[PDB]
Design an enzyme around this catalytic site. Sequence first.
Site, short mmCIF file in Angstrom:
data_model
loop_
_atom_site.label_atom_id
_atom_site.label_comp_id
_atom_site.label_asym_id
_atom_site.label_seq_id
_atom_site.Cartn_x
_atom_site.Cartn_y
_atom_site.Cartn_z
N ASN A 198 0.81 -1.23 0.00
CA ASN A 198 0.00 0.00 0.00
C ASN A 198 0.83 1.28 0.00
OD1 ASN A 198 -2.58 -1.27 -0.04
ND2 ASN A 198 -1.93 -2.07 1.97
N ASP A 250 -0.53 -6.07 1.89
CA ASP A 250 -1.76 -6.81 2.12
C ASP A 250 -1.49 -8.30 1.85
OD1 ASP A 250 -3.21 -4.47 2.64
OD2 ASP A 250 -3.69 -4.20 0.53
N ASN A 297 -2.85 -6.54 6.44
CA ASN A 297 -1.56 -5.82 6.38
C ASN A 297 -0.47 -6.41 7.29
OD1 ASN A 297 -2.61 -4.86 8.82
ND2 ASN A 297 -2.67 -2.71 8.22
#
Length: 129
Positions: free
Chosen positions: A46, A52, A59
């Site tokens: 991210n 992810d 996460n």
Amino acid sequence: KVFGRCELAAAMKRHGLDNYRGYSLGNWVCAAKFESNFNTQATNRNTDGSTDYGILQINSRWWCNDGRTPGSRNLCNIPCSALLSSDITASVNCAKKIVSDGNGMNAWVAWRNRCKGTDVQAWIRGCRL
Ligand SMILES: CC(=O)N[C@@H]1[C@@H](O)[C@H](O[C@@H]2O[C@H](CO)[C@@H](O[C@@H]3O[C@H](CO)[C@@H](O[C@@H]4O[C@H](CO)[C@@H](O)[C@H](O)[C@H]4NC(C)=O)[C@H](O)[C@H]3NC(C)=O)[C@H](O)[C@H]2NC(C)=O)[C@@H](CO)O[C@H]1O
């Protein structure tokens, strides 16, 4: 793997998700098509740096070990790669309590809007369970 609609949802009723911990069974099957689109191999990193992991969209920042997340909590205490494979038989012990921490599905982002205020009771429909 590749799950068909009726073929990737009956697995929640084999894992104690039917009406578990304040959430009804149907409230669940919806977001799945909204988090990885019925696939366990769909993952991304991210803009925040947390990577992810899987159909679950988790996460490496707050929950698992990828090691590239320093100061990562990893309260789950299992390798991030421990969920993505076709076999998910052990993949929910974390997602199970991720709600007991007192904030619910808030961890999940899509549901709060994609499945919230919806006819979520309309996704789990059409399948025998
Ligand atoms: C489609 C897509 O890209 N979505 C991705 C998400 O699936 C993914 O997950 C969410 O990541 C966010 C951060 O980016 C995360 O937010 C915080 O999560 C923590 C821990 O679970 C929550 O915990 C609260 O802690 C406070 C103190 O900080 C406590 O006082 C409170 O009681 C706690 N409540 C809970 C929920 O246990 C935070 O509440 C929460 N943030 C806020 C604003 O409160 C979500 O939890 C993540 N959810 C999941 C399912 O992982 C994200 C990560 O890479 O990437 C998105 O893109």
